[PDB]
PDB file of C-alpha atoms and ligand atoms in Angstrom:
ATOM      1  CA  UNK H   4      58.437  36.265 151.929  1.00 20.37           C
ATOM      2  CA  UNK H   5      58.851  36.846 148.011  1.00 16.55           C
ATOM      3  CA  UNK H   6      61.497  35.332 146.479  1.00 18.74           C
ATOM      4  CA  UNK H   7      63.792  37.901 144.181  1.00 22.26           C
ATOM      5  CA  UNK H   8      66.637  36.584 142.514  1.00 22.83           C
ATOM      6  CA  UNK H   9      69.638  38.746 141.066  1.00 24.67           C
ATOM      7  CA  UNK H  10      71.989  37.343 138.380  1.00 22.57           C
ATOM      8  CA  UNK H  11      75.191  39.161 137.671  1.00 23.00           C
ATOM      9  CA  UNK H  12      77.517  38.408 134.544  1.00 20.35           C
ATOM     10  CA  UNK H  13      79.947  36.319 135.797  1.00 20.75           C
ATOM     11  CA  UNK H  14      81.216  35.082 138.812  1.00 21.52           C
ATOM     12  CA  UNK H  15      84.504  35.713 140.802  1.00 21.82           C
ATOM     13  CA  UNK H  16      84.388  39.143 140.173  1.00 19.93           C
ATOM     14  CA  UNK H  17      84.767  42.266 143.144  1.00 19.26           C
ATOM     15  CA  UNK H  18      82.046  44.269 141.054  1.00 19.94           C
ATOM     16  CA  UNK H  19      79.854  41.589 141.200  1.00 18.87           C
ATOM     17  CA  UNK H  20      80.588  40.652 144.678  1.00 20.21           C
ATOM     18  CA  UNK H  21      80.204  44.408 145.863  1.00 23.01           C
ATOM     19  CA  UNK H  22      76.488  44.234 143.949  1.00 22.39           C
ATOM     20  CA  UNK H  23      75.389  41.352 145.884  1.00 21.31           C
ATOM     21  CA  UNK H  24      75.990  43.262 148.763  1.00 18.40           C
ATOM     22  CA  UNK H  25      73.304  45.656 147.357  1.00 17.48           C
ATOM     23  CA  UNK H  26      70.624  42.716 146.974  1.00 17.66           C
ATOM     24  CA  UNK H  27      71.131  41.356 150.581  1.00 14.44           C
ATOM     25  CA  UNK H  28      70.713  44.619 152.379  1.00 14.07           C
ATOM     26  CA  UNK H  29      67.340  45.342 150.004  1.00 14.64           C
ATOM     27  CA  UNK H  30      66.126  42.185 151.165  1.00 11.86           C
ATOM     28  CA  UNK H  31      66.554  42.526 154.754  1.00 12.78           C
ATOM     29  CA  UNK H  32      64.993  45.872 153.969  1.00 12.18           C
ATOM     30  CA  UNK H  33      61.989  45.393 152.001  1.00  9.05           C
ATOM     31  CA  UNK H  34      61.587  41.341 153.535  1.00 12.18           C
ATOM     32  CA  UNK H  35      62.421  39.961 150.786  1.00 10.64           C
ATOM     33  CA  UNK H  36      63.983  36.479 150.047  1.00  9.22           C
ATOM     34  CA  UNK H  37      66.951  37.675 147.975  1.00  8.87           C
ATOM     35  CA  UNK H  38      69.896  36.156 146.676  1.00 10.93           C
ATOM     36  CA  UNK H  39      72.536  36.835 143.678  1.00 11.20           C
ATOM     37  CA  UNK H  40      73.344  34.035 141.341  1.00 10.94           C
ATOM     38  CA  UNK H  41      76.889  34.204 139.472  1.00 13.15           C
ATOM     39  CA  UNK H  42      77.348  32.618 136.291  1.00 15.54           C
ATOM     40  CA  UNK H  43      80.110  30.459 135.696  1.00 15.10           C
ATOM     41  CA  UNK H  44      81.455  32.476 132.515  1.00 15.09           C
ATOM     42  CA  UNK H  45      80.144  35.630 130.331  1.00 13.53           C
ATOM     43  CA  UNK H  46      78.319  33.232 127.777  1.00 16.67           C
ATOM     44  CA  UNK H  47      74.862  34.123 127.468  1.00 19.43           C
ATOM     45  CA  UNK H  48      73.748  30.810 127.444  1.00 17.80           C
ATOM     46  CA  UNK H  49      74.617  30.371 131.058  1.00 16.25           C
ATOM     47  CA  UNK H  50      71.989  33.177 131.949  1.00 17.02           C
ATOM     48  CA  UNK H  51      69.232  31.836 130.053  1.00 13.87           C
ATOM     49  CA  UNK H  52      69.719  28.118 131.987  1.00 10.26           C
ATOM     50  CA  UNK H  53      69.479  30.112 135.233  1.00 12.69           C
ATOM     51  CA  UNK H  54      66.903  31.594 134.243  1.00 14.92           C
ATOM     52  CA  UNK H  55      64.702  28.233 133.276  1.00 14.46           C
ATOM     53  CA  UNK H  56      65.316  26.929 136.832  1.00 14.05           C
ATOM     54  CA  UNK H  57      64.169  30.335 138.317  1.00 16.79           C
ATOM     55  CA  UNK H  58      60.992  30.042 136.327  1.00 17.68           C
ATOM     56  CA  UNK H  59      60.580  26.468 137.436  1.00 15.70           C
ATOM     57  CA  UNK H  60      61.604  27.335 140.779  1.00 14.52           C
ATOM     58  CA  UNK H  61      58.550  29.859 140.307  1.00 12.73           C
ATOM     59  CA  UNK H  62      60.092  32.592 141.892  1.00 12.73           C
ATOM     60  CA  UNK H  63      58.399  36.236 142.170  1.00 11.77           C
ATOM     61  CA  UNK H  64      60.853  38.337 140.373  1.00 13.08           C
ATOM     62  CA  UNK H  65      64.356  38.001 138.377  1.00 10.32           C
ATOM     63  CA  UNK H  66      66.642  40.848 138.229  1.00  9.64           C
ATOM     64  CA  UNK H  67      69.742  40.937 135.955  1.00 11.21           C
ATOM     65  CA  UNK H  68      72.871  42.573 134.566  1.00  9.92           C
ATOM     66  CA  UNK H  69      72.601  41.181 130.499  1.00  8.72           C
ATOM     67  CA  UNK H  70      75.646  39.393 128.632  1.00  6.39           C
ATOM     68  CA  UNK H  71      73.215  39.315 125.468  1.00  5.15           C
ATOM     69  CA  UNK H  72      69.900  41.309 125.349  1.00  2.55           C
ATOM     70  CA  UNK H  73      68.826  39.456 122.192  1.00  2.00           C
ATOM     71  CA  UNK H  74      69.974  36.099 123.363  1.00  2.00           C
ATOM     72  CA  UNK H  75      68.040  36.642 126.399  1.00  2.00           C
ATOM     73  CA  UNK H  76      64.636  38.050 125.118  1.00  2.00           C
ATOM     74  CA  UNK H  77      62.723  34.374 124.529  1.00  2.00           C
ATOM     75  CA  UNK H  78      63.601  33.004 127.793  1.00  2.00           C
ATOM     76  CA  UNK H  79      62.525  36.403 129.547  1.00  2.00           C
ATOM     77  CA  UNK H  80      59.438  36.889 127.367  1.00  2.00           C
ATOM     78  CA  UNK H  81      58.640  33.058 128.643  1.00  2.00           C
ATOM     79  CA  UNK H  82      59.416  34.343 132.826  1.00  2.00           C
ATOM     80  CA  UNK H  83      56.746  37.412 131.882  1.00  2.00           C
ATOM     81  CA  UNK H  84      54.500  34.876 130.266  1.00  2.00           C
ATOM     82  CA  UNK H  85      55.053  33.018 133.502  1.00  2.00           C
ATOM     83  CA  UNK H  86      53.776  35.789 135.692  1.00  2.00           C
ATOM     84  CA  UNK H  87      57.583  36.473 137.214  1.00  2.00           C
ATOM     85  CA  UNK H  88      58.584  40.241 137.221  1.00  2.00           C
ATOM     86  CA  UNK H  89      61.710  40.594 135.116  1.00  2.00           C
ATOM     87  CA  UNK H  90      64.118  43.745 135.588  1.00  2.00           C
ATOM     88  CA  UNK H  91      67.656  44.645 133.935  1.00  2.00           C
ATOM     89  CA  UNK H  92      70.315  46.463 134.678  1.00  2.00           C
ATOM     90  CA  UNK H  93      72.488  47.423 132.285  1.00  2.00           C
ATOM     91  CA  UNK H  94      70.024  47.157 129.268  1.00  2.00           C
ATOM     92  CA  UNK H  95      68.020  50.077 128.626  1.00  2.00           C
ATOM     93  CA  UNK H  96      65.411  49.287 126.136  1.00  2.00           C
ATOM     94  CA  UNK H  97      65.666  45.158 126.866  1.00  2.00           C
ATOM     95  CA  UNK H  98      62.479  44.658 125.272  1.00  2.00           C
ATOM     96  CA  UNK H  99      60.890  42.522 127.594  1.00  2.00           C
ATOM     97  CA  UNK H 100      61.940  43.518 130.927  1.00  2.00           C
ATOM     98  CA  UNK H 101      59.267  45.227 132.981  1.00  2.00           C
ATOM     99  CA  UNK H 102      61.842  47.884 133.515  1.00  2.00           C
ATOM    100  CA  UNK H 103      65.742  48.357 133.318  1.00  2.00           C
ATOM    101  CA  UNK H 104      67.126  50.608 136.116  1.00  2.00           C
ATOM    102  CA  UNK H 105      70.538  53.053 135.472  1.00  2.00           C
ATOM    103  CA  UNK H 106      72.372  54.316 138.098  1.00  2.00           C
ATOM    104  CA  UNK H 107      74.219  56.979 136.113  1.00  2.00           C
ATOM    105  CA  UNK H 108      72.635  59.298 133.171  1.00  2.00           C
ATOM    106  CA  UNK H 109      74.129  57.349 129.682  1.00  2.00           C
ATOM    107  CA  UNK H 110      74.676  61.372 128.358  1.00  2.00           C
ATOM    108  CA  UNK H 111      76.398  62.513 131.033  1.00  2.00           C
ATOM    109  CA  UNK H 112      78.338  59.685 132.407  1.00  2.00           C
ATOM    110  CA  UNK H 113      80.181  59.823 128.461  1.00  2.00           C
ATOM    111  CA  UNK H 114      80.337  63.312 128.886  1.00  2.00           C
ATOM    112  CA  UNK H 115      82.872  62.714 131.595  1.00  2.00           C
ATOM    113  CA  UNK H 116      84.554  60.077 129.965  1.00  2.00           C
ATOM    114  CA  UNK H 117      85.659  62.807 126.909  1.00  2.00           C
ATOM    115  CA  UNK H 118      85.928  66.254 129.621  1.00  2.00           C
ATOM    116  CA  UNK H 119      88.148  64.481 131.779  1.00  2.00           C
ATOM    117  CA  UNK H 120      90.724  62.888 129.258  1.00  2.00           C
ATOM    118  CA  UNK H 121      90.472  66.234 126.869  1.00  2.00           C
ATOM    119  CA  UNK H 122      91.698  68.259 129.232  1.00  2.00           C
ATOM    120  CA  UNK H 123      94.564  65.993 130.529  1.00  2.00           C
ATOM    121  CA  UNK H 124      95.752  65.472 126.998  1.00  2.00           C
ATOM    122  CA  UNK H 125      94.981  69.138 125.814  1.00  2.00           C
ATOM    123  CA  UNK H 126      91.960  67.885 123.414  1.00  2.00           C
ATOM    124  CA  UNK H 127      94.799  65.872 120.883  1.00  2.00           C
ATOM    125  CA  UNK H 128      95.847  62.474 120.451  1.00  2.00           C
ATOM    126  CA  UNK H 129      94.776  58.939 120.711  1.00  2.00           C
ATOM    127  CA  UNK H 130      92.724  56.490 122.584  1.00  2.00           C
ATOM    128  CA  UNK H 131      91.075  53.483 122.889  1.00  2.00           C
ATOM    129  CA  UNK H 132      87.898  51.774 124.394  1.00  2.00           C
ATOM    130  CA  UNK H 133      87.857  48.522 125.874  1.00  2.00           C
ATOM    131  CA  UNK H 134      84.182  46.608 125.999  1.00  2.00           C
ATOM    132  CA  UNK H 135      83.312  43.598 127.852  1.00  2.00           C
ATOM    133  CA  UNK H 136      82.448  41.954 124.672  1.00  2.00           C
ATOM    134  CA  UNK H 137      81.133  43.018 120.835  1.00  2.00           C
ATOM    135  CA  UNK H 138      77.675  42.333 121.879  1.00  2.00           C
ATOM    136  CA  UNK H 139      76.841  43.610 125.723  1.00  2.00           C
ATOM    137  CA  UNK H 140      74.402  46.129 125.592  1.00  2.00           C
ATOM    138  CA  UNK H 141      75.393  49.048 127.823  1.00  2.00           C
ATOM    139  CA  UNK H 142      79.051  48.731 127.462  1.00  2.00           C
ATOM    140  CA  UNK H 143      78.745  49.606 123.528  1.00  2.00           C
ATOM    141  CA  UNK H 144      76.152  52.066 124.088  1.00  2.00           C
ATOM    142  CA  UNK H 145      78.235  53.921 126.483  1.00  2.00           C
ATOM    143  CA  UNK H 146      81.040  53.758 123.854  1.00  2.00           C
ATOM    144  CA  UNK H 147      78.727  55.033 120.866  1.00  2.00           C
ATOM    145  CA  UNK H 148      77.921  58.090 122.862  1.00  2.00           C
ATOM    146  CA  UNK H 149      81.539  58.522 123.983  1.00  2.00           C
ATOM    147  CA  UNK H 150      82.966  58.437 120.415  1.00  2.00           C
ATOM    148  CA  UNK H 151      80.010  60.953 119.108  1.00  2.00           C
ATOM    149  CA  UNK H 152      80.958  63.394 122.177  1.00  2.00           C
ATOM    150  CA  UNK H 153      84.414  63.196 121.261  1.00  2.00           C
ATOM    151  CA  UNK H 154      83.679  64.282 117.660  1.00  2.00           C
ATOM    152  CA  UNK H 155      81.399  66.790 118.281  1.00  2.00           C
ATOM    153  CA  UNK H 156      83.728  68.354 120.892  1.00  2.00           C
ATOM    154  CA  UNK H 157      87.504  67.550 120.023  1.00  2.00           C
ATOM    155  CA  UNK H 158      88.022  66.809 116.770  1.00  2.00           C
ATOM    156  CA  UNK H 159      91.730  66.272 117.268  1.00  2.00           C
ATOM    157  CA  UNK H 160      91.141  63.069 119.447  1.00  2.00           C
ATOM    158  CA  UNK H 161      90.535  59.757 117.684  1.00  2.00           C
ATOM    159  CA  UNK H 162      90.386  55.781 118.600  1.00  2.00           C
ATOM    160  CA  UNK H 163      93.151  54.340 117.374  1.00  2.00           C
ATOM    161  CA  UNK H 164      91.300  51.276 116.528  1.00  2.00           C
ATOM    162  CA  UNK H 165      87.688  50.092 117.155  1.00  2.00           C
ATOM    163  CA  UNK H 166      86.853  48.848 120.024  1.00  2.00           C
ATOM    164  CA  UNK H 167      88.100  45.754 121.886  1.00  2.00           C
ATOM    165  CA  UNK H 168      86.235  43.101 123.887  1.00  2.00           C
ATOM    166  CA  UNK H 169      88.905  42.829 126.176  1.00  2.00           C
ATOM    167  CA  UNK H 170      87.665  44.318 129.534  1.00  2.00           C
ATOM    168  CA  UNK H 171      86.409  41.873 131.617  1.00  2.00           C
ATOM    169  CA  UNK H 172      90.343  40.373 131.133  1.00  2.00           C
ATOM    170  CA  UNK H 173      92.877  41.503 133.410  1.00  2.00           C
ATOM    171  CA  UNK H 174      94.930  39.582 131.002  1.00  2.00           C
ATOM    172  CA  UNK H 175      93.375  40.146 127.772  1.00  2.00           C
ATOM    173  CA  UNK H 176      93.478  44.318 129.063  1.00  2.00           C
ATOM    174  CA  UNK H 177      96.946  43.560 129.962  1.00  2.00           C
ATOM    175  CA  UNK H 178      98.253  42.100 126.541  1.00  2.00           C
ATOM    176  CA  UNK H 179      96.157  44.624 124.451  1.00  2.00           C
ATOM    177  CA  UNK H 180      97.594  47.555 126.065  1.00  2.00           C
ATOM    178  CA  UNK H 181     100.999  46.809 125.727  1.00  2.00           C
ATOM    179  CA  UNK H 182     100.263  45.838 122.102  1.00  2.00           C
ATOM    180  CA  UNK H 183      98.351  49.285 121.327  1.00  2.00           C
ATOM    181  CA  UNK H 184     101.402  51.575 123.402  1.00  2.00           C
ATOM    182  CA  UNK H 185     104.063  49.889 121.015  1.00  2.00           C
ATOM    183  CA  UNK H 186     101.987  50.689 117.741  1.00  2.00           C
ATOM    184  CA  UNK H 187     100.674  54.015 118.453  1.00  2.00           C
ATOM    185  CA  UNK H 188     103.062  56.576 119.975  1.00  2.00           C
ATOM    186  CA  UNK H 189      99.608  59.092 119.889  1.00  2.00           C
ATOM    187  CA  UNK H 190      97.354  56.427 122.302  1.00  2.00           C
ATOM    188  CA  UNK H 191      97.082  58.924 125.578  1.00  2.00           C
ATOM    189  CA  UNK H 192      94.289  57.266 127.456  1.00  2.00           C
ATOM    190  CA  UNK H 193      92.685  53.806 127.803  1.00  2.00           C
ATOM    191  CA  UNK H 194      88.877  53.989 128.398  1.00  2.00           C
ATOM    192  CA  UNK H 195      87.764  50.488 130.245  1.00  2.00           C
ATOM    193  CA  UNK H 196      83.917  50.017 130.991  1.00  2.00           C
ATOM    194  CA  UNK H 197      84.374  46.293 132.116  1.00  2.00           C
ATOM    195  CA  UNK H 198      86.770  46.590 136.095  1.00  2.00           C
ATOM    196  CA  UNK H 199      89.125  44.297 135.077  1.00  2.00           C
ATOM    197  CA  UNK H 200      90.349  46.600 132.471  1.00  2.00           C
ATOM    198  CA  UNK H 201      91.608  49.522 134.323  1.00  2.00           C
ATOM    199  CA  UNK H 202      93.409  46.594 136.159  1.00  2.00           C
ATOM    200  CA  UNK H 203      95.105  44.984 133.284  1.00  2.00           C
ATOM    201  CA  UNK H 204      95.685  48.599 131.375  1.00  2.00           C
ATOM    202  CA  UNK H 205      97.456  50.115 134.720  1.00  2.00           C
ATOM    203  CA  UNK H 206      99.856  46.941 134.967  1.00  2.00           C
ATOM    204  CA  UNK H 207     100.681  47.474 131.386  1.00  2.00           C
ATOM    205  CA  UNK H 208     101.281  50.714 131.738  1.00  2.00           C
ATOM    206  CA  UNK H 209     103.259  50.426 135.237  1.00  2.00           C
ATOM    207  CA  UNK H 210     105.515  48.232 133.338  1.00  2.00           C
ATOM    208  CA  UNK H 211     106.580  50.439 131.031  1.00  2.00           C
ATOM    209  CA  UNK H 212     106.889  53.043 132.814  1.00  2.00           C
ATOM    210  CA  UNK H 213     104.241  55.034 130.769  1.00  2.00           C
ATOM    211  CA  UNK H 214     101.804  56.829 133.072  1.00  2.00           C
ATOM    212  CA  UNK H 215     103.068  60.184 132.254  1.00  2.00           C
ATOM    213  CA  UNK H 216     101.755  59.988 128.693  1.00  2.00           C
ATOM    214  CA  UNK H 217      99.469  56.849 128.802  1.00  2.00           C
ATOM    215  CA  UNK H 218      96.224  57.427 131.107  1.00  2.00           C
ATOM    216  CA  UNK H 219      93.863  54.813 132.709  1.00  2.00           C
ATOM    217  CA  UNK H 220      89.997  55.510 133.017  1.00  2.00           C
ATOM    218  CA  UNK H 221      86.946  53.544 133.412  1.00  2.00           C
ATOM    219  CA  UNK H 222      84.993  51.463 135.765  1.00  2.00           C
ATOM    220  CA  UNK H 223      86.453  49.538 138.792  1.00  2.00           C
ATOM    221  CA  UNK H 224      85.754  48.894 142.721  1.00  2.00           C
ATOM    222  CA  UNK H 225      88.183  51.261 144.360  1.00  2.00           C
ATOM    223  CA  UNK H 226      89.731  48.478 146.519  1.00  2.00           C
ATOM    224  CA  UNK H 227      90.378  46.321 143.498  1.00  2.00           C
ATOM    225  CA  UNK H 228      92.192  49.422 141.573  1.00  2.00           C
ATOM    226  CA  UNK H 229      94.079  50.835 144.938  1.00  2.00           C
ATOM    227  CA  UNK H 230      97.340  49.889 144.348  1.00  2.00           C
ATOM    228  CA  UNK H 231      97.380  51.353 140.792  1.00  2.00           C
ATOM    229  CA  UNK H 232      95.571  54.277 141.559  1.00  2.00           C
ATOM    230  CA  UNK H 233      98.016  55.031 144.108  1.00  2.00           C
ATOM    231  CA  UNK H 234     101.117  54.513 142.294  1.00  2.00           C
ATOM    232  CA  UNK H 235      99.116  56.537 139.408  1.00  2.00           C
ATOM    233  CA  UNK H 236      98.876  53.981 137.025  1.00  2.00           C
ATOM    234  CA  UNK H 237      95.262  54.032 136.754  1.00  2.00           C
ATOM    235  CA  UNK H 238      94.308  57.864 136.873  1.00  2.00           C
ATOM    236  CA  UNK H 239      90.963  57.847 137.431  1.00  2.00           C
ATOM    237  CA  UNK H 240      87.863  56.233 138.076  1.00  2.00           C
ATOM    238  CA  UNK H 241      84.482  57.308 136.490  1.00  2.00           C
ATOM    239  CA  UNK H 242      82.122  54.931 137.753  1.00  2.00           C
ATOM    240  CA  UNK H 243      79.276  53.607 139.914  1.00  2.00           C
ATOM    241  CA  UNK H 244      78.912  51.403 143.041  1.00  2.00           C
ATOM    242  CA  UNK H 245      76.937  48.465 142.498  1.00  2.00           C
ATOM    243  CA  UNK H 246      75.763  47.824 145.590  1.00  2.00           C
ATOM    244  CA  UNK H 247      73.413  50.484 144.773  1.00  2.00           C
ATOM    245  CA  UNK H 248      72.320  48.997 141.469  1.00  2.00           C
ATOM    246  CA  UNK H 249      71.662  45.557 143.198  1.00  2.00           C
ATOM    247  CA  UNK H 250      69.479  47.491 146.296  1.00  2.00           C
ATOM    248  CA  UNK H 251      67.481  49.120 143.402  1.00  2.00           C
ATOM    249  CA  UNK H 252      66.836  46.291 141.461  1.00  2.00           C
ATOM    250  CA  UNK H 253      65.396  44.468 144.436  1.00  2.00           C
ATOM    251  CA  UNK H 254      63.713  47.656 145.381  1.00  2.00           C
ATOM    252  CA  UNK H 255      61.640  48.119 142.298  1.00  2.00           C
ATOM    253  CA  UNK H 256      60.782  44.404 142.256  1.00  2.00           C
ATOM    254  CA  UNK H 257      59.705  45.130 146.207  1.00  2.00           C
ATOM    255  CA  UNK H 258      57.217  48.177 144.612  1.00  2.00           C
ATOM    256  CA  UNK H 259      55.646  45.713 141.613  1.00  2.00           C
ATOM    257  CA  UNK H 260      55.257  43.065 143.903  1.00  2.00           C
ATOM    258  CA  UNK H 261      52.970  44.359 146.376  1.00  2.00           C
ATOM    259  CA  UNK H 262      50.986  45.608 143.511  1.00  2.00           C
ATOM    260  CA  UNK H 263      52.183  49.488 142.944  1.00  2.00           C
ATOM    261  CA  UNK H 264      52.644  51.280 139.671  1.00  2.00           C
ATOM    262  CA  UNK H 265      55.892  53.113 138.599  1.00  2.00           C
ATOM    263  CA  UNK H 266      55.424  56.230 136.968  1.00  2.00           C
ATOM    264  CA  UNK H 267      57.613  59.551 136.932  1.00  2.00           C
ATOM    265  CA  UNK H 268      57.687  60.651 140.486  1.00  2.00           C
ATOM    266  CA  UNK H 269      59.058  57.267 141.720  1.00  2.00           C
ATOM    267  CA  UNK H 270      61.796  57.751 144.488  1.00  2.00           C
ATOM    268  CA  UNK H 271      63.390  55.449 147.334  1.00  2.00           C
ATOM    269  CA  UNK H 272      64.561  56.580 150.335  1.00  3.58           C
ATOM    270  CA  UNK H 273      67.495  55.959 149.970  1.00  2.96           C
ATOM    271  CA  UNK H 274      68.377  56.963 146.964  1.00  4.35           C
ATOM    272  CA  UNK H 275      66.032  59.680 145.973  1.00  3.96           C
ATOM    273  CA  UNK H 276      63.917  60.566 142.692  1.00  2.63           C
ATOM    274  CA  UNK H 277      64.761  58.963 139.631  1.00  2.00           C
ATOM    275  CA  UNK H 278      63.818  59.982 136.346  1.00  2.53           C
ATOM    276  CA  UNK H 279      61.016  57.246 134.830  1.00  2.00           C
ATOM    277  CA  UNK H 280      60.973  57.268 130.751  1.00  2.00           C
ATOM    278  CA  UNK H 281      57.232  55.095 130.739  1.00  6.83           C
ATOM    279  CA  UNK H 282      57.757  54.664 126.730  1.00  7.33           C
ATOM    280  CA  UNK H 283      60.787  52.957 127.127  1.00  6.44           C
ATOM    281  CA  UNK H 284      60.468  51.658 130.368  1.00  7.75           C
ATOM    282  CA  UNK H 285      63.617  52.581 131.999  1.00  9.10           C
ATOM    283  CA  UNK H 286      64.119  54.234 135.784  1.00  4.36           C
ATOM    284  CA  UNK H 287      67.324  56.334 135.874  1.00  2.00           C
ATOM    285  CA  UNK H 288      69.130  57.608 138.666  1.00  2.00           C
ATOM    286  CA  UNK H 289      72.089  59.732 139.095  1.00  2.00           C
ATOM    287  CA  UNK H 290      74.989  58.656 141.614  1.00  2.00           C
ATOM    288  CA  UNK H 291      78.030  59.030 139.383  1.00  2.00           C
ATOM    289  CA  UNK H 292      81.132  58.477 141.720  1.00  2.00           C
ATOM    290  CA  UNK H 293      84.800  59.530 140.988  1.00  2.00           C
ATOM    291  CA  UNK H 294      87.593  57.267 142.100  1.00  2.00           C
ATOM    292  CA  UNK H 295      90.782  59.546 142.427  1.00  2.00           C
ATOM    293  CA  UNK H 296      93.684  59.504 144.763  1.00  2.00           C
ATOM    294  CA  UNK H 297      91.916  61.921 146.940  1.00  2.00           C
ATOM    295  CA  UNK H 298      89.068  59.828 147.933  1.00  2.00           C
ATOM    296  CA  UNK H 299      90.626  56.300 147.129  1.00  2.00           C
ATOM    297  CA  UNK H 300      90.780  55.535 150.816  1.00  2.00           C
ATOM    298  CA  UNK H 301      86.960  56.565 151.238  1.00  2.00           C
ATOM    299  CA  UNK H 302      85.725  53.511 149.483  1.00  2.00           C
ATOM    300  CA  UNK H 303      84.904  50.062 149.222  1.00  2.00           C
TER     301      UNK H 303
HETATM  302 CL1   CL G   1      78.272  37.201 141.277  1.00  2.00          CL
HETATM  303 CL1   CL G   2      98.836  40.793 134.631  1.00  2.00          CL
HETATM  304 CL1   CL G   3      96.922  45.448 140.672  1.00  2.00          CL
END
């Protein structure tokens, strides 16, 4: 069978865990040999020596989710040169990926972010974004487009300092919360796209006693944030299962492999129709998923 290989961020991590899950059911579906690699930290470097035994290994495709587009580019541009299929996730534009597949649309999912804490905090008062670190790609895109929506919309909100590379810390979350709640009597809502910041923000904010004013939102597995969603620490989720990006990874490297061409039109079954930007080379689908009290008990 052909060999695809996934490569999350880090190991140890329920996200990541919950993804592989996506990359071992697309390879019993599309007979594939698939497996997910874990790095042992966040430090690009880590990726890129993966990534040199994968191309040794001569494997038929690499997916991955990017700590460093820029750090990753040569040793991609050498798996291309190679004749391995390279796909992202979580890197729209990654310049030498074949494609980069999105399970949410970036406009959209940011729009969310701002409608949902506007309207709890009656379109004034402070916030702040969390960001796995200064440099991942998608986390501080999503944040660029949340900040412009927020302008454009309610010019009454504002960050109440730039953002902070913090979320893939329960600890780091933890500590910066409590730091920003006893400076800024305004904060209202902490934004999180790394899942181990709604986790560390809605401990901070269970301890003091704060989720009246202080409101949790970002990305998380549901089972990871239960507890705090329940007790209402961490308001809501506005997120994505992984599982899903992991099946489509290993689903589009399944289509290149046995030689077909993605163009707008492109669908899975079990997914449905994405949209296909050919310039840029990015497939997009939309499967945004709410984690709320409601439906907390209806996930994974
Ligand atoms: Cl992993
Ligand atoms: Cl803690
Ligand atoms: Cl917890």
């Amino acid at each position: 069978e052909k060999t695809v290989v996934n490569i999350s961020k880090v190991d140890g991590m329920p996200w990541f865990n919950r993804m592989g899950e996506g990359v071992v059911q697309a390879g019993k579906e599309f007979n594939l040999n698939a497996s997910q690699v874990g790095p042992s930290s966040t430090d690009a470097p880590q990726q890129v020596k993966i990534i040199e035994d994968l191309i040794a290994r001569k494997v038929d495709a690499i997916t991955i989710v990017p700590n460093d587009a820029n750090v990753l580019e040569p040793v991609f541009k050498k798996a291309r040169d190679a004749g391995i299929v390279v796909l992202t996730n979580e890197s729209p534009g990654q310049p030498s990926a074949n494609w980069d597949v999105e399970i949410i649309d970036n406009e959209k999912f940011a729009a969310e972010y701002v409608e949902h804490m506007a309207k709890r905090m009656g379109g004034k008062g402070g916030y702040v974004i969390y960001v796995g670190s200064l440099t991942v790609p998608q986390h501080n895109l999503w944040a660029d487009l949340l900040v412009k929506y927020q302008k454009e919309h309610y010019p009454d909100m504002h960050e109440v300092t730039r953002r902070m590379p913090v979320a893939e810390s329960v600890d780091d979350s933890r500590r910066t919360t409590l730091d920003l709640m006893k400076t800024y009597p305004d904060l209202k809502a902490v934004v999180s796209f790394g899942s181990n910041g709604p986790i560390g923000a809605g401990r901070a904010v269970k301890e003091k006693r704060a989720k009246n004013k202080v409101a949790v939102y970002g990305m998380m597995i549901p089972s990871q944030a239960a507890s705090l969603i329940k007790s209402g620490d961490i308001t809501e989720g506005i997120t994505y299962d992984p599982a899903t990006a992991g099946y489509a990874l290993a689903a589009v490297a399944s289509t290149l492999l046995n030689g077909k061409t993605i163009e707008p039109g492109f669908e899975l079954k079990e997914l449905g129709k994405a949209e296909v930007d050919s310039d840029k080379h990015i497939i997009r689908f939309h499967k945004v998923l709410l984690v709320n009290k409601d439906n907390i008990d209806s996930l994974y």
